[PDB]
Amino acid sequence: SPLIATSWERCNKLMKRETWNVPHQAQGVTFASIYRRKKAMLTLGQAALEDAWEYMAPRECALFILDETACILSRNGDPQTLQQLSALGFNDGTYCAEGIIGTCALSLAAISGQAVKTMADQHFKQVLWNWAFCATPLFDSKGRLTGTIALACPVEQTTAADLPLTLAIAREVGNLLLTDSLLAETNRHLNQLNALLESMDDGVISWDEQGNLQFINAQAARVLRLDATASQGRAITELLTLPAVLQQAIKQAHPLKHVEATFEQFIDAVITLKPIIETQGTSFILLLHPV
């Protein structure tokens, strides 16, 4: 492979094929910080990896999550395989950068930006010739490298499915970071909408295509004598009797602008009706302009 060869030409500068020493390994405090920085990605990755292990066990393999700097954050899988790798220097905190352990999927995934497998003597370091590694980089909410999913097994036990597995897990974890961020974005829009409702002069009531009140501000609650906090999520037809004008406009999905109307004891207001036309159906905002 030109990937492997090109990687060897980077290693040939500073490294020998037969050497192997004690790991470069994040330790005590500084590892606690890396761990904490990676919380969001880590917890998602650990659940996914535990699951992958369960539907796969028994088998001689190990699963790693690594951060963007190729530091091992978490390991799981076969106890004996995990011990064999621990003895080679792969623990929590061990850095697996190309400039340390040689050409290996553990780093080559992030360097190439894709799913990669290395086996046997593809590995720059002889210590690794008894091993296969599969790895896939994973990405942010915002598309930057955030870590790597890897699978390690004795070279003679490797399977055709190992690589697509790491890929599919990295993509699962990526997308899960994305859904966390969509929910935050939707929360920020709700902050906008709630702050507008609370501060504006108009009274407001809006309901769903199914008939349910989605929001009502203090102002509309006072005037239409509704319960300012148990009205929301309830049918608008259960909450108040709508004047004939509105009632017909509603039936037709037809806007009203600054129209006069009277509600039910009797209240006279100048309203606006604003239909919202969506694929799921029609919703309404009704505003009560302050006389």
Partner: protein, 211 residues
């Protein structure tokens, strides 16, 4: 006692974060006897992420809050129970969209729907020795309190009691679902940890409803 406010729901979930922290060892210990020894660890991973997210969403509606929660539980707990507790909360979320308060009948409906979701997803039956062995009587407890027009605080105290009995009732059941059922007859004599989780939740809801 006519209703449960959303601020009560938030305080409920905060209290669940605390209980899954302090009872972590115990739940894992229950899970060591009959599973793979992780259930407390995992509920704590899930619920601490839940409680982390809560301040940002505490001013919002019940449906959105339960949706965030179930979504978080869904992807961060793992194993058999994560998808289950997830589904519970997601179903509950879809019944309470835009709500800021729930009457006792509405409370029963939410739990009814969540329970239906967990049954329909895991296929468990009365006697299978799972969390559904607590969900079903809890739902039946809440329906009864709903008919008798009990206050929310008293109703929840009663579901909380039923939930305790129901979890204890799992001890003599042989497991027919999940990892426990690998053990065959050897699962008898040991309390189900998912069931004990549901109990912890009902106990904390009961407390939240006083405040």
């Amino acid at each position: 006692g006519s209703s449960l406010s959303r601020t009560q729901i938030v305080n409920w979930l905060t209290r669940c974060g605390d209980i899954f922290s302090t009872e972590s060892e115990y739940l894992t210990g229950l899970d060591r006897e009959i599973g793979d020894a992780d259930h407390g660890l995992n509920m704590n991973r899930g619920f601490s992420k839940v409680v982390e997210k809560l301040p940002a969403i505490a001013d919002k509606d019940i449906g959105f809050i339960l949706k965030n929660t179930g979504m978080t539980l869904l992807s961060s707990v793992g194993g058999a129970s994560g998808p289950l507790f997830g589904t519970f909360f997601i179903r509950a979320a879809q019944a309470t969209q835009a709500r800021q308060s729930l009457t006792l009948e509405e409370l029963y409906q939410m739990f009814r729907d969540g329970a239906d979701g967990v049954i329909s997803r895991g296929k468990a039956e009365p006697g299978d020795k799972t969390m559904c062995d607590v969900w079903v009587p809890v739902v039946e407890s809440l329906r009864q309190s709903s008919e008798q027009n009990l206050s929310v605080p008293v109703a929840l105290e009663a579901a909380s009691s039923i939930a305790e009995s129901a979890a204890q009732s799992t001890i003599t059941m042989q497991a027919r679902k999940g990892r426990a059922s690998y053990l065959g007859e050897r699962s008898i004599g040991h309390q189900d940890p998912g069931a004990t989780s549901v109990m912890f939740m009902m106990q904390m809801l009961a407390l939240a409803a006083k405040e």
